[PDB]
């Protein structure tokens, strides 16, 4: 039980290590840019037309 | 993930176990040889 | 004893870190594809000829 739990922890560490980080280092920039732009447009639409 | 679990269990886990057993058996002999009954 | 055990843990962490992950990020795709194809063919052979 203990050994296999440790193995699951190790496996999760590896999966977050390579596959997640390699993609994140590029995808986070673009996702943040999209969030920033959509918040700007929401703030615009909040104000009245005039 | 299944592939990860399988490879972690087989490839390097037994390797680490072998080294760990090596140090464990050496220390067991060294530690218990000193004791006097 | 404690220090060397920690050193073994660290060494195992490093070995899983670089050598395992660099190869895995490419090999896992192909191994999964092979597993998928062989299961498909097994399911086929289960059914009767007609």
Curated annotation (Swiss-Prot), chain B:
Cellular localization per UniProt: Cell membrane; Apical cell membrane; Cell junction, Adherens junction; Cell projection, Cilium
Impact noted for substituting residue 19 to I: In BCYM3; results in a gain of function and a constitutive activation of the channel
UniProt tissue specificity: Found in the synoviocytes from patients with (RA) and without (CTR) rheumatoid arthritis (at protein level).
Similarity comment text for this entry: Belongs to the transient receptor (TC 1.A.4) family. TrpV subfamily. TRPV4 sub-subfamily.
Disease: Brachyolmia 3: A form of brachyolmia, a clinically and genetically heterogeneous skeletal dysplasia primarily affecting the spine and characterized by a short trunk, short stature, and platyspondyly. BCYM3 is an autosomal dominant form with severe scoliosis with or without kyphosis, and flattened irregular cervical vertebrae.
The protein's role, per its UniProt record: Non-selective calcium permeant cation channel involved in osmotic sensitivity and mechanosensitivity. Activation by exposure to hypotonicity within the physiological range exhibits an outward rectification. Also activated by heat, low pH, citrate and phorbol esters. Increase of intracellular Ca(2+) potentiates currents. Channel activity seems to be regulated by a calmodulin-dependent mechanism with a negative feedback mechanism. Promotes cell-cell junction formation in skin keratinocytes and plays an important role in the formation and/or maintenance of functional intercellular barriers.
Protein name: Transient receptor potential cation channel subfamily V member 4
Lineage, top ranks: Eukaryota, Metazoa, Chordata, Craniata, Vertebrata
Section covered of the full-length record: 602 to 638 of 871
